[PDB]
Amino acid sequence: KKIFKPEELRQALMPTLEALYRQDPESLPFRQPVDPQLLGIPDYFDIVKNPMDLSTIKRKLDTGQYQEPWQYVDDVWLMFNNAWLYNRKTSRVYKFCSKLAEVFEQEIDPVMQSLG
Numbered sequence: 001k002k003i004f005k006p007e008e009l010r011q012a013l014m015p016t017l018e019a020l021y022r023q024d025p026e027s028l029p030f031r032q033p034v035d036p037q038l039l040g041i042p043d044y045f046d047i048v049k050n051p052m053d054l055s056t057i058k059r060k061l062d063t064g065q066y067q068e069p070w071q072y073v074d075d076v077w078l079m080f081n082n083a084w085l086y087n088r089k090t091s092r093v094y095k096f097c098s099k100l101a102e103v104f105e106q107e108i109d110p111v112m113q114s115l116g
């Protein structure tokens with residue numbers, strides 16, 4: 001509390017991120033930052049004001065950018081909400097997002113209870 005040590009956040013939270021990365025096929029669109037021109041979705045940043053992806057979250061854990069664990073939870077949820085905002089409900093990314101949210105819910109609960 002209330003600025004947690006970065007090494008403690010990394011040790012506690014990284015397994016929850018790893019759980020997301022282990023999901024195949026579902027994590028694949030989330031593993032790298034979105035590049036709208038290269039992917040042919042040029043309106044992406046117009047709609048998605050705060051992009052987020054698994055590699056960025058990992059980098060933030062690795063580099064001590066979270067002061068407290070709810071900031072990490074908020075970035076994971078930002079990633080999910082961006083995908084549900086941008087994509088149509090029939091798309092792979094939308095359905096994959098929903099699966100990741102299921103996995104994350106299960107993983108994050110006991111970890112947050114342990115951190116305070």
Ligand SMILES: COc1ccc2c(c1)N(CCCNC(=O)c1cccc3c1N[C@H](C)C(=O)N3)CCC2
Nearest residue numbers: 025028029030034039041082083084086087092093
């Ligand atoms: C597009 O669905 C898939 C599904 C599986 C795979 C791939 C792509 N690919 C491509 C992965 C790169 N393309 C995207 O990442 C992406 C593309 C269009 C829309 C969106 C994209 N992602 C962002 C997060 C979004 O919200 N909409 C690899 C094989 C597995």
